[PDB]
Structure 1
Amino acid sequence: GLSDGEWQQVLNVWGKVEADIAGHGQEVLIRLFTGHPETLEKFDKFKHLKTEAEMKASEDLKKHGTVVLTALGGILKKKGHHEAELKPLAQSHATKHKIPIKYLEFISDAIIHVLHSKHPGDFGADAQGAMTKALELFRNDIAAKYKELGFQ
């Protein structure tokens, strides 16, 4: 549950991501995959990547990074009013992709990490607080749908 001041910060930060959505998306996925290699096994089309150089060189990985952050951005722009947008993602990730909620925690922290990395000294404490709350909201609403589906 975010205040409008916090949403303002979220969307301000997101402006950074949108100036280079593919670059941000790429680095987020790389941080996830290298930080938590088990997550790589959920992707039949990336499981072949064994090194980070191969990851960095992968145009399809960058492409999926764009798809992921485009979807997240559409969701963030709803400022919490994202039931329509979130439900199919929850459903596809629970039932088709079988992504445990832990992995959504992983990618949440990865976004935080990447923002600091690409914007050192430009991602203030207030901005981190707001972004973290937004990602928690996202995760928590997915988690509710996971529970409905009995998905672990």
Structure 2
Amino acid sequence: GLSDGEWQQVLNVWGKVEADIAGHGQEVLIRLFTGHPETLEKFDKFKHLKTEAEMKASEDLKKHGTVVLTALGGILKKKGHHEAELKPLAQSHATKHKIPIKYLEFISDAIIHVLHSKHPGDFGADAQGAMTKALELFRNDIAAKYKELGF
């Protein structure tokens, strides 16, 4: 898992996201959809978005960005004690949304990219290390639930 020091870094970095949850959420999703168009196809409500300009101008995309990062933030603040929070997400994403674990890798990478893009020079090597460990823990615990479901 993560050390106390590493969790402290994770939640310090997360303060950046919390100051503009919608903007961070929007950019993470645009980074995901533009880097991996196949992911857009998993959202019936976003597949109409043909261009990044349309994505940027979509208020519903920003709304979903807020939902996604709010859920993640909740999970992170549990500092690994997140079984109850993670279980329903693993289930909905495997069974209902049919999201391969690879796409969770993509969005983890997107979060790291957006943090650098929005805070260049203010996302230090230790911070990236800790946030990356937290996102891997998230992904690893989700993967365990995916395997249970055979997904």
Q: Judge same fold: TM > 0.5, yes or no.
A: yes
Distance (Å, rounded) in 2 between the aligned partners of 1:36 and 1:90: 21
Shift of 1:52: 0.2
**Equivalent position SS for 2:41:** helix
The number of residue pairs the alignment matches comes to: 151
1:15-67 per-residue CA deviation (whole Å, 9 max, x = no partner) reads: 00000000000000000000000000000000000100000000000000000
Unaligned runs of at least 5 residues, structure 2: none
Shift of 1:135: 0.2
**Identity score, percent:** 100
Shift of 1:137: 0.2
Shift of 1:11: 0.2
Shift of 1:86: 0.3
1:76-124 per-residue CA deviation (whole Å, 9 max, x = no partner) reads: 0000000000000000000000000000000000000000000000000
Distance (Å, rounded) in 2 between the aligned partners of 1:50 and 1:146: 31
Distance (Å, rounded) in 2 between the aligned partners of 1:55 and 1:26: 9
Give me the TM-score of the superposition, normalised by structure 1: 0.99
Give me the TM-score of the superposition, normalised by structure 2: 1.00
RMSD: 0.3
Q: Which runs of 4+ in 1 moved over 2 A?
A: none
Shift of 1:14: 0.1
Distance (Å, rounded) in 2 between the aligned partners of 1:117 and 1:79: 25
Distance (Å, rounded) in 2 between the aligned partners of 1:75 and 1:96: 20
